[PDB]
């Protein structure tokens, strides 16, 4: 059966997952929608309390101890494993978060992380009334959390005593708990708080302190711990704890505030945010809350693109994924070691490490954050942690991956944000070091670091360097090496990117040397990995030179990366396999060719993940845009659309848009079904086919939650809106038209020192502006096209070239900004954080 005719998912949950009725802001594509939203939110008292939310907090609101593993599709209820139960704590600072969390205990109970797990609670609160320490039961139906705070209601069994907790971690790692205490009777209530982080201080003091070496002694923190009563008096130290007795009048609440500053010398605002709350102007619970939540939400305005499609279920997953990219990051500014840079992390609630395979994948989205430090820091961190090879090169290496495209992803980031020659040259140099290290890696003593054991211009691996790579399951080939299409595409992509970065820097000699290396790898991929017998790109076994008979989407990375020449009839036929769900299904979105997996009686896992969806989307994108896949009917616009819908659907626990959670992976292994395909047997084909029917389901969600393992928001910016980053001053749009979508917008990209927005509004009726496909640069209309088309705009010349066979009618805006920089004309100044990554100086 064909992919073009598989069913769509059916989203469940809220009617208004983008909370459209909570945001009255009219869209003007010439300005930041999130800025205007924020302005209207503040006018409406956003941040004054937990009943007045900023829009992004409303969207990503999680209420209750929900969900619990009960979902529904169009046919009926299904059980699933791996509900998160709204038990993790979202609120976190740039370095501090809860690795584990006990939501039904006051304070911050669970494994506190400062970069990584400390095995310590942040702080606990004991409530003593009537002479007794009280059990405060959470009413979990009142549990509410957002990216910026957590709140719940705690009550004694007899309901004589209630505490509304509001807790939040500030940007610079102050862990704060507001407790609103109410008694039905006049009472003296003694609160005691204790922190494993800070227990040093004289009885009668108003602060406790400590010093804690973090995991792997990467730094030392100097925690300070204090609290105040509603009248601003401080809690007093007693026995290495803080204590206060409230004189409660019946039915009269009093609000206290506890703060633990996880203070680092290298983060001076950690001290400032703490001191403001200890004795400064943020002592009051309400002011402390409004400052933290406002600051949290300002980051979205400043960093996140705004994406709007006709499918608000996808839009909410896009907001959730900007949050995944922000939440799964470390910005600790640690001196010496690599965490001196803002870096993407592969699952802060999981393995919590920098994995080179996924680092390059994450930067496909983080490059779209408006500030370049949130992508540059990731590739600088890879360059700083690179492993010295026996041959004298430095190659990217996990800082606890069979492969990586960090240099290409870094180059993509530079094509978005730019920078001077020293930035371009640094990326090229770490890139060239890595490519050369891999080419020469036959000299690596660890066999898994040896990626070129026949010493040619192709990457080779054995299955020990790993991924669902069914190619390695070929009978008779256990432990054998093959020259890899994927490894070779990624090394080519790095080499090609390094050549481009050398050129952008002005380093002609190194640009030509890397171009020569790229040209050789490309020639060897097209000559050695092209199976002319069946017009497929295949891995090649080192021992006999035989093509690997079994296939995965990894076979197509030479297309994904643009290694393969275009306009080659034979090369373009390789993508025919994407026609068939039997070969490469849309959902579940597997890496392994499923016909191949079946031919071998199902070796490996039945798992699927965003790590499979991202490269599948990359193949679909390159396939459609460059290798004629939609013209051939191999990968149609409708199929691309269906994959976006399935990818969004997978994010939702039980298909319910209230409960987004990107697990490390999914499967249907526990999907209790019969012979659904009618082949005589109950195997994984049955579980997987059933899961794609009746609106979809995922019966197993893995134990690592709110993680990233690949990422997909780039599809909205680059395929739907069509943005093609370039080194030069020209803006290229190459949209993949989504059938039935009469509007969309990507708002407030930061691209070559310009605000950029893209609008599709078929007849202008949705946004009330120009009809058609419009680009905004610098707050002015650049151009409007009557249709979605492949357009290259030269702002310096005021020309738009129509590159496709559309008869697209384009008009250039009367006030178009002409002076759009090329990437290598962007400079950084002392007021850009990115300057501190490389250096009050400028980077020119
Ligand atoms: Ca929408
Ligand atoms: Ca090789
Ligand atoms: Ca069957």
Numbering used by the authors: 38 to 437, 446 to 511, 516 to 888, 892 to 896
Please quote the paper that reports this structure.
The GH121 β-L-arabinobiosidase HypBA2 plays a key role in the degradation system by releasing the β-Ara2 that is transferred to the specific sugar importer. HypBA2 is an exo-type glycoside hydrolase that releases a disaccharide (β-Ara2). HypBA2 is a multi-domain protein with 1943 amino acids (aa). In this study, we report the crystal structure of HypBA2 as the first three-dimensional structure of GH121.
The refined crystal structure of CΔ1049, which contains the core catalytic region of GH121, comprises residues 38–894, and three short regions (residues 438–445, 512–515, and 889–891) were disordered. The overall structure of CΔ1049 consists of a mostly unstructured N-terminal region (residues 38–123, cyan), a N-domain (124–303, marine), a linker region with two α-helices (304–347, orange), a catalytic (α/α)6 barrel domain (348–771, green), a C-domain (772–870, red), and a mostly unstructured C-terminal region with an α-helix (871–894, yellow). The second Ca2+ (Ca2) is located in the A’-region and coordinated by the side chains of Asn497, Asn499, Asn501, Asp505, and Asp532, and the main chain carbonyl of Leu503. The degree of amino acid sequence conservation of GH121 members mapped on the molecular surface of HypBA2 clearly illustrated highly conserved residues in a pocket of the catalytic domain (red). Three conserved acidic residues (Glu383, Asp515, and Glu713) of GH121 (discussed below) and two short disordered regions (438–445 and 512–515) are located in the pocket. Because one of the three conserved acidic residues (Asp515) was disordered in the crystal structure, the neighboring residue (Ala516) is shown with a magenta color in the figures. A triethylene glycol (TEG) molecule, which was derived from the crystallization precipitant, was bound in the pocket (a green stick in Fig 2D). The TEG molecule in the pocket appears to indicate the location of subsite –2. Then, we constructed point mutants of CΔ1049 by site-directed mutagenesis. Based on structural comparisons, we suggest that Glu713 and Asp515 are the likely catalytic nucleophile and acid/base residues of HypBA2, respectively.
